[PDB]
Amino acid sequence: QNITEEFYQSTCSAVSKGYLSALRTGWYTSVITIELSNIKGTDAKVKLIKQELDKYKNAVTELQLLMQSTPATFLGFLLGVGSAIASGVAVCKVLHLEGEVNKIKSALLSTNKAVVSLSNGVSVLTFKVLDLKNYIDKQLLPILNKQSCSISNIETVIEFQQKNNRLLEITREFSVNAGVTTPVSTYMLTNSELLSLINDMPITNDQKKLMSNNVQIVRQQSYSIMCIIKEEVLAYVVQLPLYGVIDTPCWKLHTSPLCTTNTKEGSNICLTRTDRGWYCDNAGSVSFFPQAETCKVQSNRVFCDTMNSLTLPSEVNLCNVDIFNPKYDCKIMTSKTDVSSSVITSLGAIVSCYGKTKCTASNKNRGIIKTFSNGCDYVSNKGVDTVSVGNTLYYVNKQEGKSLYVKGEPIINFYDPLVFPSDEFDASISQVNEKINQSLAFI
Amino acid sequence: QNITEEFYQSTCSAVSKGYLSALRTGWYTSVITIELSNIKGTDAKVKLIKQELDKYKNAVTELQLLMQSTPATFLGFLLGVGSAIASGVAVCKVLHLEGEVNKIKSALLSTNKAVVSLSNGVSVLTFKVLDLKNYIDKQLLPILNKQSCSISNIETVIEFQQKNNRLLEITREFSVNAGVTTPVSTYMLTNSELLSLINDMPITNDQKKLMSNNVQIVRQQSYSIMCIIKEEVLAYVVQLPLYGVIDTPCWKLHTSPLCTTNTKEGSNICLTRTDRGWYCDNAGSVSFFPQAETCKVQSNRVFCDTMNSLTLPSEVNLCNVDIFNPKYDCKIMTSKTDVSSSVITSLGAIVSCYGKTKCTASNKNRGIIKTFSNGCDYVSNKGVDTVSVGNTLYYVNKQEGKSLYVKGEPIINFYDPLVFPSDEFDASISQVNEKINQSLAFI
Amino acid sequence: QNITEEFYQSTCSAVSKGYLSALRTGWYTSVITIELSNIKGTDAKVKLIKQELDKYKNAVTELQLLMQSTPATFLGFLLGVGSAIASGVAVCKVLHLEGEVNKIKSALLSTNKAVVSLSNGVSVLTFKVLDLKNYIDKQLLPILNKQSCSISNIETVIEFQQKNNRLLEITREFSVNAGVTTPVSTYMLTNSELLSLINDMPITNDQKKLMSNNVQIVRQQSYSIMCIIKEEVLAYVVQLPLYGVIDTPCWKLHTSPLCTTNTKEGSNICLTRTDRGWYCDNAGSVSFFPQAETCKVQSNRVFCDTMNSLTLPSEVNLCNVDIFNPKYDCKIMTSKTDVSSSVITSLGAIVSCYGKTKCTASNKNRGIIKTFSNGCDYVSNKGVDTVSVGNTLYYVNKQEGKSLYVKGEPIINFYDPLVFPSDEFDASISQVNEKINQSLAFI
Numbered sequence A, B, C: 001q002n003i004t005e006e007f008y009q010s011t012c013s014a015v016s017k018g019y020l021s022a023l024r025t026g027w028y029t030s031v032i033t034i035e036l037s038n039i040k041g042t043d044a045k046v047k048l049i050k051q052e053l054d055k056y057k058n059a060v061t062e063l064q065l066l067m068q069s070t071p072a073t074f075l076g077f078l079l080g081v082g083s084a085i086a087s088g089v090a091v092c093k094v095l096h097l098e099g100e101v102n103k104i105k106s107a108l109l110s111t112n113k114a115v116v117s118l119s120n121g122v123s124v125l126t127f128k129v130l131d132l133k134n135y136i137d138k139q140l141l142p143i144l145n146k147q148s149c150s151i152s153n154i155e156t157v158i159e160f161q162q163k164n165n166r167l168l169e170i171t172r173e174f175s176v177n178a179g180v181t182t183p184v185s186t187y188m189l190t191n192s193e194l195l196s197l198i199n200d201m202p203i204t205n206d207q208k209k210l211m212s213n214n215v216q217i218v219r220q221q222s223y224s225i226m227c228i229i230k231e232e233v234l235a236y237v238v239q240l241p242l243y244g245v246i247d248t249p250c251w252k253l254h255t256s257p258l259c260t261t262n263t264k265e266g267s268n269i270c271l272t273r274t275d276r277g278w279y280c281d282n283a284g285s286v287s288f289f290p291q292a293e294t295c296k297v298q299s300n301r302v303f304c305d306t307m308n309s310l311t312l313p314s315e316v317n318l319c320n321v322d323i324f325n326p327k328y329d330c331k332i333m334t335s336k337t338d339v340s341s342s343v344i345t346s347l348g349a350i351v352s353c354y355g356k357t358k359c360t361a362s363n364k365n366r367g368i369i370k371t372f373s374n375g376c377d378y379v380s381n382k383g384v385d386t387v388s389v390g391n392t393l394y395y396v397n398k399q400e401g402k403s404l405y406v407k408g409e410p411i412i413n414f415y416d417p418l419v420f421p422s423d424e425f426d427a428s429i430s431q432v433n434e435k436i437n438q439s440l441a442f443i
């Protein structure tokens, strides 16, 4: 779509818009299974088969030993605390109840894909992705018993190594992740397996299309939870994201310190909007993601997780156009630390240049085209390739889109430095006003 | 065991207890070795062997190039700063002293497991996990020399690929981890290798049992440090956790913001207990782990690292029953930021619901069964599957255990908002009282 | 070199010096390519080949599906915000322009290494690391067509698995990293490939030597960005670090809380220098890296990234010798939280011991050799192996180098606790003085 951006000189911040939401709001749990074999002079070929067979037995033993316990795993400090795999773990707990695994084993007898309702009413999609039981009970078992121990060909050795390797790698992953992995690898679930899983999922076509067109994101937002080995069934729960909010407007708020620029060192005061992060319209409110690194952007689609959000009044948006607006108390932090830096935005760069710092913007071939004066300023990515603040070189994002420079008096100029409350972190416009009023009162 | 939980309405916090400790207090260093070979018309089979031989030589060269340098690698801000592999690195430094590697090579001549005392008095367990010297000097060397270059069979090609692969993977791991890996993979140390290493370790039976029953945790708390290649010996130090504290009571403290709930926006004041995290009885004091994510829970056993702890007076526990107790100055932060969230506990959910936020608790099949009013409240996981605060859905942990709701007046009601010191982060009950006394004095 | 260290008793801090810089200041983008094949009764050998061929087709399809979108990915809070792969992504965008891939394909027709200037003037080094087109169009295609479907030998099966495996692993990596990986693995770029890439790079001999002697660090500071599949060319951009600052002095500042040690609990005040981290002389200024974990140390060489730095006046160094110096306003935080901890330095250990905490330093064989009294103190690593503060055991670094203990009155003694501004985080000597002056004024 049309990604656009606005820089507000008055508050040293910038909003990038035109993004479309894809928010993980829920979890879907599928049960992925591997059917196992329960099995007991040597030539070179049979020796290899027995070595591979040992790797198979060891992997099973290792996974069994692994499940002796229950499976487990600016404004960010305001977030709540969730339990990411509580739902997957609950489904896994149900799989341990007597008869439960047997239901699944029976379901997948004549097909590899099936929906099974568990005893607690939970309806899970089930998937047998590998039948090692059939392979070992055929092909291999006849050669290790009938002509003890050899009627063997090299192609069988190769084939067994190929088939067993998936089990070995899944086991490797679980072994260094304490039975819980994320992102979900293609060993857990191949691309085709995941795609057909998504297709057979109880979701809308919009969700199926969204997930199929972004499987690499789906993998990053999924968990594989090692669950149970019982009755020749190896089962792990794959916990998949449900995107219950799709195609709502999203915008990214970038902020940077705004300081006075007086000559005398240490006489300057600063203010920074702390409400930077991703914002998405969501159900009459606004979902706010303070750790913008928790969201992943694909073109103009932004994938976030509501577990890492606050739910805010939509008036929080007013802080962008009018930070002194009466409907929402815009959040800021204050300080006297006027250090220089830059924030690279979607479509340009914010530059907070203070003191003796050299701040410039350059083009690839031309070199320096703008030298920043002290204060907070901005340049768009059109005709600009890099920005330098001090010894730090920044490459700007080269995505196409228009920027708008909104001129306005830096609001830091509205404050008397003699009564300015610095070192306020979790503050706001009203809180700062409140403290200023008290300092003025005592004077 | 019996996991139980208590919610304190007065302070918007909850303690989960019944856990048993397993604290890493020390480090054990073992030396793991791979014995290497020092070696110099083609048919298809020999061509493959030579290709595999090149992968072997390259891996050795790569690891040699790698060791041109020395190996290196709310209240969390209060923690000290350690050097995690200082002990392993020190042992590795000793291995570089002349004659030192030769001692090990000699020790493992007729066995794969041996204890060796180093020249500095350190007694290390040593383990030859792979003898590539013997394999290459036999089997392979006779075919690349005698009938230059071919008396070869396909099973030898396969076998060499299998044996060499471990070396290639170990090399891969070290290459993207700058010679220091964690968790320790099954390439570094297979499950059987680790289990027998643990068995031969100079530790108590309780420790051996604990480590053997939790090898996946042991791996996560271990380091593999690439150390030396000298005299056909490849050696890496595996640094294993020593659990010097086992089976002491542990409890997890969950906290959430407690705010007044007045109608007028921005007129509310908040307070949050900052001492959330894991607590374990330890040697007459209490080990406090502020970053509860640094601990791993397996059923009712909790694995932590003392490097990520403070050592506190046991009176810190009093803050749970009486936050105004005279024996310990309970830590809190203050603010006016009354945003809504939930904290998912071991056995329920704390809900901090403020403003216009929709806060509910639901069952799987029934739907909404409780709607929270403004304030801090709690619900147990019995009959509850999810909690929703705003647009954020939380699944609760479904583990069995009893919760106790301890009623009490929210302590935030005891404060006059006109003299309440907000934006205090590293604060406490007494510090807040102290500041209130000064504001009252000037009035 | 000579690593030395000084401990300042007056401020509970220590500086380690003698380090040499290697700062990533820029980015170089190379284009790595894999040439692909565009291809359409069974015996065991051909069945395996067709299975491997399917893995090849699936990998291609998977990577194609992957690129349906644009590629994306105390005092730390003061840092700016960059876009790490903006330059690589920009080059990738250029590769999508018509004719652009064809230029590269033509360039690498008769050689595997070539420099190509793109249409936007960017000169990129290009590298064909694998020719699957040639392998499949030869060897394989003649057997799947001519004697449909079998004139096959087992060595061809093996060889194809070996050659195809790299493609499968690269695909695996991109699949769980959303097309952007770091560190750059040996699948993306083998050690030999990287070394010759570095050799053919447009950089000085000093840089080539530095990068070649530290390829494992180079990998950690590099990105592999999956870019395009078009006209039988698979291309990913590898974004390599440019070290524009080499061999300037670096030093590491360690700090720890300095508190009064009065008997009455809660009557103590504390101060901590917040400017801890790595410092490097750089272009007439000092590059300051607050998150010292963002730098990697190899012997006496320290690798940092300027994106994680502030650019400071060189007078910031004065805070080490004279924290009350008039030329730079040294940064500190204040509190009343007198908890005990230790900071392990390059050549010793800082111990902040308060309250009832047991604080000691030990040798390997002798045991406790020093018991710390309350206050901030230090011990060198000479003759010391461990330090214990409370229940936390610390191993000290055993690297060789001399320490100097600089005696001086703890500056916390210069403050009157009755007017001491605690809970100041982003503070400084002057700011604290300023607040003290106001509290004294109102009294």
Ligand SMILES: CS(=O)(=O)CCCn1c(Cn2c(=O)n(C3CC3)c3ccncc32)nc2cc(Br)ccc21
Pocket (backbone or CB within 6 Å): A074, A077, A423, A424, A425, B077, B425, B426, C074, C075, C076, C077, C333, C334, C335, C422, C423, C424, C425, C426
């Ligand atoms: C890891 S850390 O940065 O050190 C956590 C520091 C938390 N902390 C706070 C709250 N706070 C933050 O969270 N950040 C930035 C990390 C986002 C701040 C920046 C500027 N002012 C206060 C900030 N106030 C404190 C007062 C005292 Br005394 C000791 C710690 C304090």
